[PDB]
Amino acid sequence: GPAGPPGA
Amino acid sequence: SPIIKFPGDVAPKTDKELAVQYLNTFYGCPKESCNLFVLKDTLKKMQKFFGLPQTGDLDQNTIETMRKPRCGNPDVANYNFFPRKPKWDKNQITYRIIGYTPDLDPETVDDAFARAFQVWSDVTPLRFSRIHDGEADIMINFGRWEHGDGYPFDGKDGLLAHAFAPGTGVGGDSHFDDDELWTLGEGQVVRVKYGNADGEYCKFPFLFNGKEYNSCTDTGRSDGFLWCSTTYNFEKDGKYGFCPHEALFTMGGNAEGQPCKFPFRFQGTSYDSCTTEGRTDGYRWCGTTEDYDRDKKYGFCPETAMSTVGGNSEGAPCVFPFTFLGNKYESCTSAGRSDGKMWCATTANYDDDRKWGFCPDQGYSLFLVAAHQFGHAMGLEHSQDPGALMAPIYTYTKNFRLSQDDIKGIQELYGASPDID
Amino acid sequence: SPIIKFPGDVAPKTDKELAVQYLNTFYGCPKESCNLFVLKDTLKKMQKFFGLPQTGDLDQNTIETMRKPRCGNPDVANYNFFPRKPKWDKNQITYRIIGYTPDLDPETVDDAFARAFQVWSDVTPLRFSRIHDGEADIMINFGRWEHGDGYPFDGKDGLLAHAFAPGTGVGGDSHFDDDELWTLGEGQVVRVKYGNADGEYCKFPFLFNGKEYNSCTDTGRSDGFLWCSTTYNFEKDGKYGFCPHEALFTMGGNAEGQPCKFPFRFQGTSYDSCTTEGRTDGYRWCGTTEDYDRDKKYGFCPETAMSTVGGNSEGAPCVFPFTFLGNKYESCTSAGRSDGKMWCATTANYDDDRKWGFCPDQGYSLFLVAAHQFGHAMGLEHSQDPGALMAPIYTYTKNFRLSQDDIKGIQELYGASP
Ligand SMILES: [Ca+2]
Ligand SMILES: [Ca+2]
Ligand SMILES: [Ca+2]
Ligand SMILES: [Ca+2]
Ligand SMILES: [Zn+2]
Ligand SMILES: [Zn+2]
Ligand SMILES: [Zn+2]
Ligand SMILES: [Zn+2]
Incomplete structure (x- = not known):
């Protein structure tokens, strides 16, 4: 989705 | 006129509980016995260290200093390490990037860690060398809160990183808080x-x-x-x-640029984001299908574009313009805030939906923060010279230069670069 | 109605596609070279093995047995060029469990393996001791498809397990296909x-x-x-x-019986299910909060209750009666495939919602399959005696008993109970 999948 | 509390913001700690964790983390004030008098003595050690007045009271000039972003390492000695005063029994050290940060692509990071290391290599015999396999002298990695060593982190800002002094085990390891907006110092x-x-x-x-x-x-x-x-x-x-x-497109793998498919199942686990699971290089990758194991199609997620930070909107992009309490907005603002934080609404108008997020700020130059962290890995400790790279608090400097104090510090420890002819 | 392809399902294999793979994994038939007289000569080595009419062709006798759940090890040996006819050089063997199945509770699994080991010690001077940390002689784990050894599994049914002959390295290791409905032999x-x-x-x-x-x-x-x-x-x-x-409750940890939170972030990754990430004892856990790092709240996931298996309904029970291809069903059907496996829509209507799941069958006894695998872990190979525990095709035997073939085999290796 734009934003991005949570996580780093 | 109104300064409201946003529906979702990270709860500011009390000046008291802020001073307790600070003195406890950077001073040594007894974790549970850091009550009034026993802290007053310490509070003054903090004060002495910084330019502050040794009152021993929680005066604003103090809590103002305690509130600024800074390193994870302490400012006081572990009440005198008889056995210690670190050194690298060699002038050839090896490092290894165990993991990365999505804020930056692998090369930028790699380079930053490189440039950070040269800083000390320019004035000492010390020579650095990246290795890709097995244990390294300095093992670099990114983590959040508690990341495997009982010296946890704290969320965006506050502590930024830390590193252990030279030695075996985790000796020299440098760890950076994975909850920071890692940049080169001037914005995303x-x-x-x-x-x-x-x-x-x-x-x-x-x-x-x-x-x-x-x-x-x-x-x-x-x-x-x-x-x-x-x-x-x-x-x-x-x-x-x-x-x-990654929700747009992958980089490498065999999916031919198809976006990651969340969640995707890899063995007994369903990942909802990119992982490094099953990898050693710290390169995130993901399944561009709903069952990696079944159809081995996958891609890599080498970086991520941050629309918004924190808030409630899970990263959802700002929406311009947006209405906030009868006033239309066309940019980020501090409206309704106090602190200094610039935000925006991640929907058309805020009043109706009440969905917001912080607008990415200046973040922390990985180069500077790393350079510093590596100063420790070589053995150096915090200096009180606020201009010195080894100073506790973080400060961005367009064009960096090692402080005399620093040069005097690393060299008294490793000696200067050898005078060739 | 025709045969329809269901969402998320695997792609069917043809009768021939199957045979060729079966003779490839199990008989050594060269993939690209397994055709004409080679497929014929090979088909026969296989039909002989399973005491089928040695036709040499793909005939409803051979096929039928080719699609019966069986062990993932070969039927043909090579242990000549494959290193020395194995056999632990000591009677004191140690096994470590590094992974479990959500199908059975830690204990029930721990036992099943234990009972399965006991099956070999009962007749020989061999003793097995579980260990909880380190490199054991026999490492037990569950995995799917390619689970890190070049010998991939295949999803539901089919190859059920595999193990390596005694030896250093992966030798003795016993791995189980995690895509299987692991059971005690009589259903969930x-x-x-x-x-x-x-x-x-x-x-x-x-x-x-x-x-x-x-x-x-x-x-x-x-x-x-x-x-x-x-x-x-x-x-x-x-x-x-x-x-x-894990959707209802949790066990242990500090979550205090709270559900998991999917997804929940743990360091640079978002988990949409329980995981063992971090642990070294295969125990499944999950954040019971949205940020495990922040909240430090978590709970274990010891076993998952299933009312349906596989599919896209992630476990959700059937809905009777349900509507498929315009028609209505009041029970599990096979309507729509070539493998006659029972499936059901998890919603009054399928066509529009397209949510389905496999009506759970009888599953496979972890005991027996483990028993079998440990047989290889000790140096044994497949038997042509359908009775022998070491026969490849799987068969539920409530009153399990080692075959006289097995006892002889294991103890011509190690000798009998001292
Ligand atoms: Ca080290
Ligand atoms: Ca932090
Ligand atoms: Ca071994
Ligand atoms: Ca299988
Ligand atoms: Zn520092
Ligand atoms: Zn650390
Ligand atoms: Zn077998
Ligand atoms: Zn395997």
């Missing part, structure tokens, strides 16, 4: 993909169609891909490119 | 917690409200917690318990 850094300027960094802010954009935008497109200008004036210079983002 | 198992029978297995089927239940239900419950009767007649005996799940 995103390296463009494809477009007429592949490999150049998005240039924030950039001027496009009479508008200024301080982050990648999907304006002018219907495929929903985020792009940006690699220069300021998009009209004059027509350079632009695509911003990384 | 669910050890219940709390209630008035905590520690008891669910009794399927069980009768409640004048009705049969072959899985847990939230029926007659308002909170939606899953339960089941631990005895058949729920009236003559009022014992029952609540069935596990």
Whole structure:
């Protein structure tokens, strides 16, 4: 989705 | 006029509980016995250290200092390490990037850690060398809160990183808080993909169609891909490119640029984001299908374009313009805040939906923060000279230069570079 | 109706596609070179092995047996060029469990392996001791498809397990296909917690409200917690318990019996299910919060209750009656495939919602399959005696008993019980 999948 | 509390913001700790954790973390004040008098003595050690007045009271000049972003390492000695005063029994050290940060692409990071290391290599015999396999002298890694060593982190800002002194085990390991907006010091850094300027960094802010954009935008497109200008004036210079983002496109693998499929099942676990699971290189990758194991199609997620930070909107992009309490907004603001934090609504108007997020700020130059962290890995400790790289508190410096104090410090420890002829 | 391709399902294999793979994995038939006289000569080595009419062709006799759940090890040896005819050089062997299956509770699994080891010691001077940290002689783990050894599994049914002959490295290792409905041989198992029978297995089927239940239900419950009767007649005996799940509750940790939170972030990754990430004892856990790092709240996931298996309904029970291809069904059907496996829509209508799941079958005994695998872990190979535990095709035997073939085989290796 734009934003991005949570996580780093 | 109104300064309201946003529905979702990270709860500011009390001046008291802020001083307790600070003295406890950087001073040694007894974790549970840091009550009034026993802290007053300590509080003054903190005060002495910084330029503050040794009152021993929680005066504003103090709590103001305690509130600034800074390193994770302490300012006091572990009440005198008889056995210790670190050194690298060698002038040839080896490091290894165990893991990365999505804020930056692998190369930028790799380079930063490189440049950080040269800083000390320029004035000492010390020579650094990256290795890709097995244990290294200095093992670099990114983590959040508690990450495996009982010296946890704390969320955006506050502690930024830390490193252990020279030695075995975790000796020399440098750890950076994975909850920071890792940059090169002057705002979000995103390296463009494809477009007429592949490999150049998005240039924030950039001027496009009479508008200024301080982050990648999907304006002018219907495929929903985020792009940006690699220069300021998009009209004059027509350079632009695509911003990384795993929900859009992968980088490598065998999925041929298809976006990550969340959640995707890998063995007994369903990942909802990119992982490094089953990898050693610390390169995130993901399943571009709903069952990696079944159809081994996958891609890599080398970076991520941050629309918004914190808030409630899970990263959802700002929406311009947006209405906040009868006043229309066309940019980020501090309206309704206090602190200094710039935010925006991630929906048309805020009042109706009440969904917001913080606008990415200046973040912390990985180069500077790392350079410092490595100073420790070599054995150096905090200096009180606020201009010295080894100072506790973080400060951005357009063009860095090692402080005399630092040069005097690393060299008294390793000696100067050898005078050849 | 024709044969329809269901969502998320695997792609069917043809009768020939199958045979060729089967003779490739199990017979050494060269993939690209397994055709014409080679497929014929090979087909026959296989038909002989399973005592089929040595036709040499792909005939309803051979095929039928080719699609029976069987062990993932070869039937043809090579142990000439494959290193020395194996055999632990010591009677004191150690096994470590590095992974489990959500199908059975840690204990029930731990036992099943234990009982399976005991099956070899009972007749030989061999002793097995579980260890909880380090490199054991026999490492037991569950995995799917390619699970890190070049010998991939295949999803539901088919190859059920595999193990390596005694030796250093991966030698002795026994791996299990995680895509299988692991059971004790008689269908799904669910050890219940709390209630008035905590520690008891669910009794399927069980009768409640004048009705049969072959899985847990939230029926007659308002909170939606899953339960089941631990005895058949729920009236003559009022014992029952609540069935596990990570969506309802958790065990241990500090979560205090709270559900998991999917997804929940753990360092640079978002987990949409329990995981063992971090642990070194295969125990499944999950954040019971949205940020495990921040909240430090977590709980274990010891076993998952299933009312349906596989599919896209992630476990959700069937819906009777349901509508498929315009027609209505009041029971599990096979309508739509070539493999005759029973499936059901998890919603009154399928066509529009397209949500389906496999009606759970009898599954495979972890005991027996483990028993089998440990046989290889000790140096044994497949038997042509259908009785022998070492026969490749799987077969449920309630009253399991080593074959005279097996006892001879294992102890011509190690010798008999001292
Ligand atoms: Ca080290
Ligand atoms: Ca921090
Ligand atoms: Ca071994
Ligand atoms: Ca299988
Ligand atoms: Zn520091
Ligand atoms: Zn650390
Ligand atoms: Zn076998
Ligand atoms: Zn395997």
